[PDB]
Amino acid sequence: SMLERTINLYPLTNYTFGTKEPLYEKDSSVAARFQRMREEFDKIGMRRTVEGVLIVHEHRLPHVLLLQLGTTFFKLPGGELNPGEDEVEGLKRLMTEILGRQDGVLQDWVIDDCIGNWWRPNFEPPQYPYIPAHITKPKEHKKLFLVQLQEKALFAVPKNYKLVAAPLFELYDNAPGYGPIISSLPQLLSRFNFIYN
Amino acid sequence: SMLERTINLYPLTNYTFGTKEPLYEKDSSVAARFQRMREEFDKIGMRRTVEGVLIVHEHRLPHVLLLQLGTTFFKLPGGELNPGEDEVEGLKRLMTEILGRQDGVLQDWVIDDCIGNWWRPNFEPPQYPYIPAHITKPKEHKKLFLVQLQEKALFAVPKNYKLVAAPLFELYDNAPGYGPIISSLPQLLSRFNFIYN
Ligand SMILES: C[C@@]1(Cc2cc(-c3ccccc3)no2)NC(=O)CC1=O
Numbered sequence: 001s002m003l004e005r006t007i008n009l010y011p012l013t014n015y016t017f018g019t020k021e022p023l024y025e026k027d028s029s030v031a032a033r034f035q036r037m038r039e040e041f042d043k044i045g046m047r048r049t050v051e052g053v054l055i056v057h058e059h060r061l062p063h064v065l066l067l068q069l070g071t072t073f074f075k076l077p078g079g080e081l082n083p084g085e086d087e088v089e090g091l092k093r094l095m096t097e098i099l100g101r102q103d104g105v106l107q108d109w110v111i112d113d114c115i116g117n118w119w120r121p122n123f124e125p126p127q128y129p130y131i132p133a134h135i136t137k138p139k140e141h142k143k144l145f146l147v148q149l150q151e152k153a154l155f156a157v158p159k160n161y162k163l164v165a166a167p168l169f170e171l172y173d174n175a176p177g178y179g180p181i182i183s184s185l186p187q188l189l190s191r192f193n194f195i196y197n
Numbered sequence: 198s199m200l201e202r203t204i205n206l207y208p209l210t211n212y213t214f215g216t217k218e219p220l221y222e223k224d225s226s227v228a229a230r231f232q233r234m235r236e237e238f239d240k241i242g243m244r245r246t247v248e249g250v251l252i253v254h255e256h257r258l259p260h261v262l263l264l265q266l267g268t269t270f271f272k273l274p275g276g277e278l279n280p281g282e283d284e285v286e287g288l289k290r291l292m293t294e295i296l297g298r299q300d301g302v303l304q305d306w307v308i309d310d311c312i313g314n315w316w317r318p319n320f321e322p323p324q325y326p327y328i329p330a331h332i333t334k335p336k337e338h339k340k341l342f343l344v345q346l347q348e349k350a351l352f353a354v355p356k357n358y359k360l361v362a363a364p365l366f367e368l369y370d371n372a373p374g375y376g377p378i379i380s381s382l383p384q385l386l387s388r389f390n391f392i393y394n
């Protein structure tokens with residue numbers, strides 16, 4: 001009857017958030033983003049994106065680490081796989097790129113849980129947790145993984161981003177604030193047995 | 198990188214839906230429902246409810262089996278555990294009670310996946326996929342399980358219910374139609390690798 005995965009959470013105060021050089025997006029606008037998505041689809045097919053969910057707590061209240069581009073959109077650490085790249089090795093690479101330390105000490109990322117899939121049917125913003133009706137060639141597949149943090153870690157945040165610890169109640173039913181993926185993280189995390197260490 | 202659970206789905210046409218005597222709710226109204234919930238909380242503490250998600254497909258389109266009380270509210274097969282009752286044995290008991298055959302042939306329910314948790318903080322309708330802030334004594338804990346169906350099965354539907362096969366797109370973002378639990382099932386099922394048999 002214990003069919004739940006057990007996940008160790010540690011206090012937000014256990015983690016050190018340093019700073020490093022800005023990390024710039026490949027697209028300077030939504031228009032460019034969808035242009036490049038069109039160009040790559042015609043060369044190498046469906047975009048494969050991976051996103052990591054990193055959880056901490058304070059006073060046994062779970063928080064998801066989000067990356068805020070200045071004071072704009074919130075995103076999960078993650079991004080685009082290269083063609084032929086393993087999903088898990090790819091997320092470890094992208095999370096090292098985004099939050100990895102300047103002193104070049106290896107963070108040990110542990111990824112043992114897929115927590116969802118999202119599909120983009122067109123070169124447009126709408127994404128669904130399923131392939132919609134009549135769609136044979138989705139333009140993007142996004143896969144979310146739960147990342148088990150070590151007890152303590154040093155993270156280097158690119159100077160152009162803020163790292164925010166978002167409590168679940170704030171995500172819940174707040175698609176306008178966070179979009180349909182991050183806003184459904186409370187539902188997607190409810191199945192886990194969190195230890196508050 | 199295959200961290201997904203693999204789930205066999207079969208066609209809706211593989212399953213036989215017979216009929217049996219009505220199965221009446223213990224509460225004749227929302228008011229009675231919350232009254233009885235108050236009375237039991239003071240005797241035996243937090244209500245423990247279990248709900249099963251049974252999935253089929255037609256033409257590789259996944260459908261969740263819902264029970265419609267006449268033409269009213271949609272519910273998952275499930276209900277209240279007795280004090281000291283195992284969650285999994287309890288859901289098998291409740292699903293036998295609701296959909297079990299009249300000829301008293303055993304359905305073999307396979308339950309290997311928790312897909313979420315919901316908490317009712319007050320004797321009121323609101324439920325959250327987490328224990329809300331300042332709540333030490335939640336009044337109900339609801340646990341959802343994915344039920345792996347056999348290739349073929351005979352189900353006996355109580356005459357006062359309809360068994361509806363609901364496609365995911367219809368559930369998605371339709372809390373008004375289905376409430377916050379069923380409406381978030383597409384997100385909660387997205388992590389599974391469905392085989393369409
Ligand atoms: C190639 C790369 C690498 C990348 C990831 C991030 C990033 C993701 C999440 C939070 C903060 C930063 N910025 O650049 N460039 C892009 O424009 C998308 C992408 O995958």
Ligand SMILES: C[C@@]1(Cc2cc(-c3ccccc3)no2)NC(=O)CC1=O
Pocket residue numbers: 220221222223224264272273274275276277291295358
């Ligand atoms: C004790 C019991 C048994 C039960 C379950 C169902 C039922 C659930 C889902 C779909 C269709 C029918 N109706 O009665 N009586 C109640 O009033 C709640 C409960 O747990």
Ligand SMILES: [Zn+2]
Pocket residue numbers: 058059060
């Ligand atoms: Zn504390």
Ligand SMILES: [Zn+2]
Pocket residue numbers: 141
């Ligand atoms: Zn795909």
Ligand SMILES: [Zn+2]
Pocket residue numbers: 255256257
């Ligand atoms: Zn077919």
Ligand SMILES: [Zn+2]
Pocket residue numbers: 338
């Ligand atoms: Zn509980």
